[PDB]
Amino acid sequence: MHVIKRDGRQERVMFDKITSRIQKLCYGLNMDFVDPAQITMKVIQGLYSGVTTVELDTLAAETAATLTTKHPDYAILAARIAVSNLHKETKKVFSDVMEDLYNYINPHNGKHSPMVAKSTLDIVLANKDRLNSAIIYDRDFSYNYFGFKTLERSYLLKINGKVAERPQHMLMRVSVGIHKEDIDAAIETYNLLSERWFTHASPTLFNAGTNRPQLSSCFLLSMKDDSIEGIYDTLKQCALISKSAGGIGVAVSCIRATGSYIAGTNGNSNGLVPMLRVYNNTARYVDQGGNPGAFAIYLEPWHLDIFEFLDLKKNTGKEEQRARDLFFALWIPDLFMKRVETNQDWSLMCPNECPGLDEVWGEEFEKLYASYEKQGRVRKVVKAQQLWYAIIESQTETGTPYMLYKDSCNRKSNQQNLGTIKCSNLCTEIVEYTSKDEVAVCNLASLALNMYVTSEHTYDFKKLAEVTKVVVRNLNKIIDINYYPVPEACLSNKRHRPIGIGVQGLADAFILMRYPFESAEAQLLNKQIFETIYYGALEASCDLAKEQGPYETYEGSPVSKGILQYDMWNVTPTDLWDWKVLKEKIAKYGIRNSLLIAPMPTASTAQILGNNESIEPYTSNIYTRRVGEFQIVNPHLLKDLTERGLWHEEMKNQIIACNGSIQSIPEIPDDLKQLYKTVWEISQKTVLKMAAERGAFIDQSQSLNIHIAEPNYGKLTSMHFYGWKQGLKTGMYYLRTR
Amino acid sequence: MFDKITSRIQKLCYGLNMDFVDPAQITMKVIQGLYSGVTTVELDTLAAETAATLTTKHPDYAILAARIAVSNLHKETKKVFSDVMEDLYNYINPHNGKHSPMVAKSTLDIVLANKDRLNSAIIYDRDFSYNYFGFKTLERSYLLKINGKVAERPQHMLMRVSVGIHKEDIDAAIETYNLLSERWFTHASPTLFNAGTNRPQLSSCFLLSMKDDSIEGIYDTLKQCALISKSAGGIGVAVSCIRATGSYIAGTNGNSNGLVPMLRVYNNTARYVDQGAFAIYLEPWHLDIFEFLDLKKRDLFFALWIPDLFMKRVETNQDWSLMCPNECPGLDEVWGEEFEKLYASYEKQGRVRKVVKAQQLWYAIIESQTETGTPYMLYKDSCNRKSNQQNLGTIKCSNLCTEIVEYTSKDEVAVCNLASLALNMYVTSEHTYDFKKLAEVTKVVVRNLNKIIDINYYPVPEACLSNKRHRPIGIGVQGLADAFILMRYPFESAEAQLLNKQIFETIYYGALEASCDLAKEQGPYETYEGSPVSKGILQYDMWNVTPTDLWDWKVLKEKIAKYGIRNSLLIAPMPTASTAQILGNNESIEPYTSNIYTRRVLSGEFQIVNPHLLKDLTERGLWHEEMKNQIIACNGSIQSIPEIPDDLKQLYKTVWEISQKTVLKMAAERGAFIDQSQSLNIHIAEPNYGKLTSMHFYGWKQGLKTGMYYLRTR
Ligand SMILES: CC(C)(NC(=O)CN1C(=O)c2ccccc2C1=O)C(=O)NCCCC[C@@H](N)C(=O)O
Ligand SMILES: Cc1cn([C@H]2C[C@H](O)[C@@H](COP(=O)(O)OP(=O)(O)OP(=O)(O)O)O2)c(=O)[nH]c1=O
Numbered sequence A: 001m002h003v004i005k006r007d008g009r010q011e012r013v014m015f016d017k018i019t020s021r022i023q024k025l026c027y028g029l030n031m032d033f034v035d036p037a038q039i040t041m042k043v044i045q046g047l048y049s050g051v052t053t054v055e056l057d058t059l060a061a062e063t064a065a066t067l068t069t070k071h072p073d074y075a076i077l078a079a080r081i082a083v084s085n086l087h088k089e090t091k092k093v094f095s096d097v098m099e100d101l102y103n104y105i106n107p108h109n110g111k112h113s114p115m116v117a118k119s120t121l122d123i124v125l126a127n128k129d130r131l132n133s134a135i136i137y138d139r140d141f142s143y144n145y146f147g148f149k150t151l152e153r154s155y156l157l158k159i160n161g162k163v164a165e166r167p168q169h170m171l172m173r174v175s176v177g178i179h180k181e182d183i184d185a186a187i188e189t190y191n192l193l194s195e196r197w198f199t200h201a202s203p204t205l206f207n208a209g210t211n212r213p214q215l216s217s218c219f220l221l222s223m224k225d226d227s228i229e230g231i232y233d234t235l236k237q238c239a240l241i242s243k244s245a246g247g248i249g250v251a252v253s254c255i256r257a258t259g260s261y262i263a264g265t266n267g268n269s270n271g272l273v274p275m276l277r278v279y280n281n282t283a284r285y286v287d288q289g290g291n292p293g294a295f296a297i298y299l300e301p302w303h304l305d306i307f308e309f310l311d312l313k314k315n316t317g318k319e320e321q322r323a324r325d326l327f328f329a330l331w332i333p334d335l336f337m338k339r340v341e342t343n344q345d346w347s348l349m350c351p352n353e354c355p356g357l358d359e360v361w362g363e364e365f366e367k368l369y370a371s372y373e374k375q376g377r378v379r380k381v382v383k384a385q386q387l388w389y390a391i392i393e394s395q396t397e398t399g400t401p402y403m404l405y406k407d408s409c410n411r412k413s414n415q416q417n418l419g420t421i422k423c424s425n426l427c428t429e430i431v432e433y434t435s436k437d438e439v440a441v442c443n444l445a446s447l448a449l450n451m452y453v454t455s456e457h458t459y460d461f462k463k464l465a466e467v468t469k470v471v472v473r474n475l476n477k478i479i480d481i482n483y484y485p486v487p488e489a490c491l492s493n494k495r496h497r498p499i500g501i502g503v504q505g506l507a508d509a510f511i512l513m514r515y516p517f518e519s520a521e522a523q524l525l526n527k528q529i530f531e532t533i534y535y536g537a538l539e540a541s542c543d544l545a546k547e548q549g550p551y552e553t554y555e556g557s558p559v560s561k562g563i564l565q566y567d568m569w570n571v572t573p574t575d576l577w578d579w580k581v582l583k584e585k586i587a588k589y590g591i592r593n594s595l596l597i598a599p600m601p602t603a604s605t606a607q608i609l610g611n612n613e614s615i616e617p618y619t620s621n622i623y624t625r626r627v628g629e630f631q632i633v634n635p636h637l638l639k640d641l642t643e644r645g646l647w648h649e650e651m652k653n654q655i656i657a658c659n660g661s662i663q664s665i666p667e668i669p670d671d672l673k674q675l676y677k678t679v680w681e682i683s684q685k686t687v688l689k690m691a692a693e694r695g696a697f698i699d700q701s702q703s704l705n706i707h708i709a710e711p712n713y714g715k716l717t718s719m720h721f722y723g724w725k726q727g728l729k730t731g732m733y734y735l736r737t738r
Numbered sequence B: 001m002f003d004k005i006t007s008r009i010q011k012l013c014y015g016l017n018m019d020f021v022d023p024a025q026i027t028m029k030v031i032q033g034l035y036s037g038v039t040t041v042e043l044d045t046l047a048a049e050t051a052a053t054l055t056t057k058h059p060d061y062a063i064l065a066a067r068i069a070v071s072n073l074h075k076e077t078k079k080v081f082s083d084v085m086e087d088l089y090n091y092i093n094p095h096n097g098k099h100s101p102m103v104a105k106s107t108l109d110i111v112l113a114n115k116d117r118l119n120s121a122i123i124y125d126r127d128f129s130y131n132y133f134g135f136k137t138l139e140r141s142y143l144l145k146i147n148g149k150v151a152e153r154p155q156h157m158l159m160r161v162s163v164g165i166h167k168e169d170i171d172a173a174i175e176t177y178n179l180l181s182e183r184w185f186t187h188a189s190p191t192l193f194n195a196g197t198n199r200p201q202l203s204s205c206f207l208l209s210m211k212d213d214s215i216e217g218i219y220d221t222l223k224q225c226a227l228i229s230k231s232a233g234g235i236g237v238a239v240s241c242i243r244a245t246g247s248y249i250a251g252t253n254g255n256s257n258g259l260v261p262m263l264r265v266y267n268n269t270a271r272y273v274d275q276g277a278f279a280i281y282l283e284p285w286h287l288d289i290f291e292f293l294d295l296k297k298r299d300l301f302f303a304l305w306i307p308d309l310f311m312k313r314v315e316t317n318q319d320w321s322l323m324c325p326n327e328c329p330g331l332d333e334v335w336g337e338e339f340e341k342l343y344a345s346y347e348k349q350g351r352v353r354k355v356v357k358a359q360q361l362w363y364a365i366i367e368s369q370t371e372t373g374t375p376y377m378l379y380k381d382s383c384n385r386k387s388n389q390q391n392l393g394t395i396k397c398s399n400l401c402t403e404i405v406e407y408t409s410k411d412e413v414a415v416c417n418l419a420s421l422a423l424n425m426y427v428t429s430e431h432t433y434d435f436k437k438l439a440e441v442t443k444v445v446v447r448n449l450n451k452i453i454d455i456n457y458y459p460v461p462e463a464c465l466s467n468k469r470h471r472p473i474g475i476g477v478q479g480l481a482d483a484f485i486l487m488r489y490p491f492e493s494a495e496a497q498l499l500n501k502q503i504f505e506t507i508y509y510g511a512l513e514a515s516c517d518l519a520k521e522q523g524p525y526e527t528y529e530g531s532p533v534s535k536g537i538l539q540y541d542m543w544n545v546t547p548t549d550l551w552d553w554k555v556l557k558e559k560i561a562k563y564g565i566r567n568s569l570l571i572a573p574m575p576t577a578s579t580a581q582i583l584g585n586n587e588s589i590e591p592y593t594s595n596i597y598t599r600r601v602l603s604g605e606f607q608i609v610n611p612h613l614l615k616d617l618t619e620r621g622l623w624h625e626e627m628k629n630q631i632i633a634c635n636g637s638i639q640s641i642p643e644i645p646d647d648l649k650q651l652y653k654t655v656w657e658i659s660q661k662t663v664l665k666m667a668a669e670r671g672a673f674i675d676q677s678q679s680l681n682i683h684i685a686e687p688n689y690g691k692l693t694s695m696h697f698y699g700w701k702q703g704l705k706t707g708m709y710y711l712r713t714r
């Protein structure tokens, strides 16, 4: 028939032609129920006397995509269809893409617009010879579809509207954006970024090697002062960060509660309820412009406005008086948990009546708080369980507030010497020091935990621990060259140098190592997996101290005084790793990095390489993405449903009506039922259990979500108090129900 | 006892024309207190209260109601100024315990040395000069309050204001006091508030230009904004410089959300920081102009900064290009016959983001005004061509009240510290106007306001740099309505029109003669050289209005040509709401809005009628409880009731039936002797868009700076 080619000529569209043009790609697929026949069918069964070739692979790719439910290989295939009709549509070699990206011109103004950077490009052509050939473009056939169309949507820079990079072109520029002048490691960084041994978090990918590269995600802000001059110089600070697309965690603990005396202008303060709507509208003002930004507010429960802090995301409320786009978080000191569970009363205080109440934690905070109580100098006295179910009443309504434990989050941080951490980040994993002239930042890089497994289901620990070895130096260099939108951010992270190495797909990891997520083997691996990262991190940060000198303010720190993160948890480690010689190695030289581990949640940067989204296990065995609107079942799961033939259309529909609960239907081996157990089914005691076990080797904190489709009050009460009781820094990210 | 209170009562009824005043009916309504309880002051509490109720019978019951509250304010306040000042600095906040000096050591110290002459120069029978409703606006905020109890007397606060301004200058202090106390004028509200206090703010005015289009500049304007709302200041903001909705963002590759989500951050800011509200000045060429008049349809007041074109292409039924100040830069920053050439550029260059018929825009503004009242109308190309800061550059906005027109920049956020004139104190018991002292008093006020410039604690250093060079001062007025009424003029009359020419002339040449005097002493304001008046041509020349033979300006033109003036701008009629709800004079320059009005004192609601109306009504007997109701039924109008000699309903007519054609008339006739603008309110309660279209243009055809403040309906 009738398709106009890549030319401008015509070709007889034939089934024999297309089914073989797909057979060109199907390599690395068990091609036993993978079948290029029945792609071509629905395609040709709509092929009209028209329709070009690329605009036929629009059909061919998006059709093999929808038929991923037949096998998780079809997604990886539907990718190559779209990728190959991106390859023949994209410039073939790297230096030619880069040169073509800097000479970019904006057709609105005519203003010459450097997509990349002169700070980068000129080092790029400098090694054009080997760099260009050091790119295996056969590695963007290793991505799955639903990840690739997270890639091209916003990760692959386009020119005037259409794609300008290939995924490898994007990955190499990233590895060039990081090391710039360095090449022996730049291609090394690429050579792990490409075959997905890991990834840098979202912003490190976008504008690595653009002019003023902004390589940092979330940022942290303590309130400058208890002053409008300090407040709006804080408000400016964060508005600037959301300019440069930055997540933000703010300690607003420092602020005059509602009804607190103002000496300067003889009125009472308005509290945070009005002060925070200011941040609310700041958020959906400056997005970056084109989807919205949002900041995580960290108010400590001793603050008089804590109840009204909690009324703030009740679905639909009181209009002129309520905020939405802000995310809320609790920076909880041990004491509150204590006399909730002892059911003794609780004092609510103003940080001005009771000054310096946010800049103190733990045993030091036990008494300073009780000192005001004896003086009588508090505003509200309420039974501690009040504030407690009122929090749960807020969480059961929404999912917020977040739950961080200050006197667990400060007890076990390497930044203690700098003072009290008054807050965490947007997604509650980063626990760094913040102040008037300091706003520490997140240097983030996900780890694809599923990749370090043998085809014999044994773990490749000594490679995980040296990939991190590379991950740490990347994030170090990122600290220097990263554009800091605010001068304090620089002169913070330039000081402390905290980097946050996150992980993803430990959902997938447990599964592909053949472990049920709950098993006493997972458990048993969950240690060592995070022993591995931390070890490789400390080992890498140590080699860096002996080369560039320990960060500003290194000694004073827990490690400089000779006692490490797990030692703070009293959780003595496992003997993979000879920790004695690491401590000693850390001891002559030091470390370059204040904090290292931060299991940060990754969504887009997880969607991209098919791993399931942070540390959380699979939520629904069958789930969906939209870029049509495609059904996708768990890869792993269908991997085994087909190996032994228990997957039909009279099975797919059964699992959908289960929310992935493949536990009901008894034609599936209980070897798989245990293994692919949806997170809901998992009594979450064990998840936080696990978190605490792995948290011992986490410098900062870990963004943990909690899933119970049927959330009671005590069944939520006994949840937090498990996590807090057994040591966690971050108790809960979101609450998911239905 | 009944015969004990009535004695206690006209022991204060002196000066109150005792025919339609009667002391017994006061004692009668208070005996409902029934005694067997109530202190010695609770009596006098509701006794004043009772007298204030009866302003309905005579405006003298109000003045009496004052003294009652006042004579039992002096009872519960010690009687000497230096004492009051002493306890005001030796104040301790007992919620706390820390030392909190409510006045200033820097001023007390100044008080105690010149103590013996200051305390005696204070006349303490001038608190009796105020009337009740004025007195309890005073009670609330102006009189400093030691531990809840009023620590000051009106005198004690006013002498504090005098001493706060002159500081070491005592001879000029009793000066400013004796005409502050004899109500010959008054300073701005924040002045009377923190004059002589620790870290004093003496300004409200306050203007702001976006120091950029960038976030960095958006929030250092916002940082500045909250800082000023901290210091209890209302701001006019120039936001014309800001990216329209969707106008391509640079390195973030985003597109702008434009104005609306921005102003919402300012909205919320304006509500977060009280101890307030901001005005936002957006020129009609900005693209987001339609997303602009829907926000009004909130804590922000809105305003258009209109160039001559927009009107010229609204009459002529001609199109209109809405532009982005980024595609079409420097567009807000240019004015007049020149601006139209720059605007017509991007017209021909074609870079325009949305073009609509200009009259559609226009009625779209009338649609927002009829509902709300906003936006304020101020004519750009009509402000700068008649402004004395025309040399410093295009003035890009006005204040939150639209009387101030001052240059604003990267670090110059102009203030216009303020003081109003009691225009009704200048009359004879021979019904002729006293122009002599009006200059003389204005002579003083300029110098005080200029002392205020030097001592004022400025919230942002940018405001300091603006006031120290320009040294501008907004000298406003009040009781315009009462002046005509005491000169026995109708507001609309031609001898209202004579006099109003003259009235602002004497003020202008009173202020110019005053501003000329402290170029001698200190040296011309630094950016004098270049300004239109350093170029020997004044405000009334830019309107080309030949002044009255009243004064000899040829003399004044020629004083100024020598030494010069320490000030850039001089005249600027406020809307003196509280700042005038004290003396007994009608709010700014507008006529009597409604002959009978009511103010809410806490819980009570007292019927208060036009003090001159009733006092002329009663002179005839033709006033009563039926007359009374008939006037409230008209929401002000006394034209219905034919009993009234038709001479008096010319005199007291309300601004409703005062043909606005002719309000904007007199507004132009005085605007020539006004260095800045004028807060002009517009009043029609049944407003076809036709009326609004014709009243608006009458303004910019007549060359006004402010086309319109508020719209006012029902
Ligand atoms: C208030 C007044 C008329 N009467 C009182 O102090 C006490 N009293 C009575 O035994 C009595 C009986 C029946 C009706 C009303 C009253 C009443 O008021 C008074 O002047 N009583 C004289 C006693 C000194 C206190 C007093 N001057 C004050 O400051 O209120
Ligand atoms: C509404 C809105 C405006 N803006 C504005 C304010 C930012 O400073 C600007 C982008 O910053 P820049 O990229 O620095 O702006 P620019 O280089 O194009 O020139 P200018 O600063 O004068 O605009 O766009 C946003 O960035 N985000 C938004 O959501």
Ligand SMILES: Cc1cn([C@H]2C[C@H](O)[C@@H](COP(=O)(O)OP(=O)(O)OP(=O)(O)O)O2)c(=O)[nH]c1=O
Pocket: A225, A226, A227, A228, A229, A231, A255, A256, A261, A262, A263, A264, A265, A268, A269, A270, A271, B229, B230, B272, B273, B274, B275
């Ligand atoms: C002016 C103002 C302050 N505040 C509160 C919140 C801020 O923490 C703080 C900043 O303003 P200030 O009260 O002026 O801060 P301050 O340290 O100078 O306190 P004081 O004047 O009593 O000596 O006041 C409001 O809540 N609303 C307001 O309008």
